């Protein structure tokens, strides 16, 4: 039943707020570090943010640095993306992965992104 | 930032086999993912650790990693292997995960 | 750069030995060739009192033990204990924050690194290595020891090497005296199997720094073997006294043995 | 006082001239005209003196081997 299930997608206009979401179920939650990825139309992939597996730890990309929020709820098995000041740029599918944490740590040396969610739909249009 | 090269786009024939170039910088010191996307639907890995494979990815995928020439190998190439493929790496050097270029494999 | 968090942080309680008669090192660098010279010098005492804990390299398991902030005093004696390289270096300094200067001594795979900056270290100062199963061979690639060096006082880096990812014996004497923090080393291959070697070994000279800082504190730093999921290292830390020494040299101009004047009415006469 | 390093690595310590109470400090005193000895074992047998400690008092090194004073 290992699944991932995005939302909190939506067309918006550029300076706004947006909130993603990720539900997680049929496996356990807190032993994996979870990411988003997001893939502009017609373009490659591109990683957005990572939070480990306890969320002590949390890792951006420059381009979303200072405008986007990494957090997990471990009790409910969600993943969620604060998305702030909203750019054009910004337009893109938004996927949530999860990769196995050795023993405390998910640097993602000896596992990758093995499961990946369908995807949340983000347009950013005036 | 760190820069993951690859070629664009890769033809083979049916039967024949296809090779796919990772491009980094140090990338013999890296761990090297791979990930299969048809159009339409989200990526898959079928390589990680530079040359395992996931439970379900049939034994024609194979990934190298020697002497700075990471590869990702699929021999007896059938139709449904027409994807896109992008190699990731974790560089620890700016606290990234990075996608590579991408390619496309589109079977003559 | 950005340093790792750990939530759960812990460290193992101390355990104490003895330094048997350990620690002697060279004071100057005059030839003498069979013969007994004295001198007053910065010595560990024989039969000083040791405190010594254990370097986890390996998680196995979500518990982040740390290594303790120790004294300085007037200089300590170092000494590991280990298969692999797990000890990779120290820092030094007083606040050990921005506010003053600190001094990093660090070995990577590469080279050794000395630094002294006003170093904003990490809570849990990291070094992290992992298997390349596709070279076999270990690559350390985590170095998260500090998240901010500015105004920086000293730099200096060693020519690269490779260092190997029976056990080993290496031991240290560090003095910070004048403005110079002088550092003796010495490695010997040990046979043994658990606690500090009994014997004599005295530590050349390795070098001396004109960093010019005051050190009242330290830290152990050592690596982290990440693995996808027991024979930890062992340190040992005595301290310096200012005592009078009597070294005997051999006729090629090896410390053979000594004796401490102020140990015993026995060694005052010798 | 001290017999040969040959011999052994343990010794007596005379504070010349000094009383048994201003006094490393091993439970083997005992006041001698000449001071106080610390760490021989007063013997009230007589033999010849080996290693002169002073106002006729010796001391030697013998029987489990020990530091005597007579
Ligand atoms: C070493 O130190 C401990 C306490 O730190 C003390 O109890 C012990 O007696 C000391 N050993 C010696 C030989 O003085
Ligand atoms: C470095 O020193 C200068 C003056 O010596 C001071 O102005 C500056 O603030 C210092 N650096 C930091 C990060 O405070
Ligand atoms: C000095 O070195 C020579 C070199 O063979 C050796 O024969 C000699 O024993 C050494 N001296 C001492 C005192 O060990
Ligand atoms: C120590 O005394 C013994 C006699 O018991 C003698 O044989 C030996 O030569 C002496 N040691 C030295 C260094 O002369
Ligand atoms: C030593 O001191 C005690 C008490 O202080 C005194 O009774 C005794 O006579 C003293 N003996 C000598 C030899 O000074
Ligand atoms: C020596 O003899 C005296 C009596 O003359 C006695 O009081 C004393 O305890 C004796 N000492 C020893 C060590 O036997």
């Known amino acids: 039943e290992v699944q991932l299930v995005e939302s909190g997608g939506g067309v918006v206009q550029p300076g706004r707020s947006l909130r993603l979401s990720c539900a997680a179920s049929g496996f356990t939650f807190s032993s994996y570090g979870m990411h988003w990825v997001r893939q502009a139309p017609g373009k490659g992939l591109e990683w957005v943010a990572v939070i480990w597996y306890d969320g002590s730890n949390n890792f951006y990309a420059d381009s979303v640095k200072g405008r986007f929020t990494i957090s997990r709820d471990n009790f409910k098995n969600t993943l969620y993306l604060q998305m702030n000041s909203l750019r054009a740029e910004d337009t893109a599918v938004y996927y949530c992965a999860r990769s196995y944490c050795s023993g405390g740590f998910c640097f993602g040396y000896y596992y990758g992104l093995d499961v990946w969610g369908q995807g949340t739909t983000v347009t950013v249009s005036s | ?108 | 750069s950005q340093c790792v968090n750990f939530t759960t942080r812990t460290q193992l309680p101390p355990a104490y030995t003895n330094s048997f008669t350990r620690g002697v090192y060279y004071p100057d660098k005059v030839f003498r060739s069979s013969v007994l010279h004295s001198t007053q010098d910065l010595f560990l005492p024989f039969f000083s009192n040791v405190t010594w804990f254990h370097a986890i390299h390996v998680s196995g398991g979500t518990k982040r033990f740390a290594n303790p902030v120790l004294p300085f005093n007037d200089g300590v004696y170092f000494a590991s204990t280990e298969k692999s390289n797990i000890i990779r270096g120290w820092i030094f300094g007083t606040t050990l924050d921005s506010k003053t200067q600190s001094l990093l001594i660090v070995n990577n795979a590469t080279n050794v690194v000395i630094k002294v900056c006003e170093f904003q270290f990490c809570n849990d100062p990291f070094l992290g290595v992992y298997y390349h199963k596709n070279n076999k061979s270990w690559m350390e690639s985590e170095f998260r020891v500090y998240s901010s060096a500015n105004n920086c006082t000293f730099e200096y880096v060693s020519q690269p090497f490779l260092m190997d990812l029976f056990k080993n014996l290496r031991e240290f004497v560090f003095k910070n005296i004048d403005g110079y923090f002088k550092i003796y080393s010495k490695h010997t291959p040990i046979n043994l199997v658990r606690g500090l070697p009994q014997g004599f070994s005295a530590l050349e000279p390795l070098v001396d720094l004109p960093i010019g800082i005051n050190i009242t504190r330290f830290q152990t730093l050592h690596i982290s073997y990440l693995t996808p999921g027991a024979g930890a290292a062992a340190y040992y830390v005595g301290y310096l006294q200012p005592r009078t020494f009597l070294l005997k040299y051999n006729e090629n101009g090896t410390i053979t043995d000594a004796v401490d004047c102020a140990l015993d009415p026995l060694s005052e006469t010798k | 006082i001290t017999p040969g390093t040959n011999t052994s690595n343990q010794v007596a310590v005379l504070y010349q001239g000094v009383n048994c109470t201003e006094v490393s400090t091993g439970s083997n005193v005992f006041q001698t005209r000449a001071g106080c000895l610390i760490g021989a074992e007063h013997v009230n047998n007589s033999y010849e003196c080996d290693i002169p400690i002073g106002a006729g008092i010796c001391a030697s090194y013998q029987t489990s081997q020990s530091i005597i004073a007579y």
């Open chain 2, 1 to 108: 930032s760190y820069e993951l090269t690859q070629p664009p786009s890769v033809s083979v024939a049916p039967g024949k086999t296809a090779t796919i170039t990772c491009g980094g910088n140090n990338i013999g010191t890296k761990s090297v993912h791979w990930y299969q996307q048809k159009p339409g639907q989200a990526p898959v890995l079928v390589i990680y650790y530079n040359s395992d494979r996931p439970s379900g990815i049939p034994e024609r995928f194979s990934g190298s990693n020697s002497g700075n020439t990471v590869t990702l190998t699929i021999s007896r190439v059938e139709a449904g292997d027409e994807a896109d493929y992008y190699c990731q790496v974790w560089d620890s050097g700016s606290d990234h995960y990075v996608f590579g270029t991408g390619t496309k494999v589109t079977v003559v």
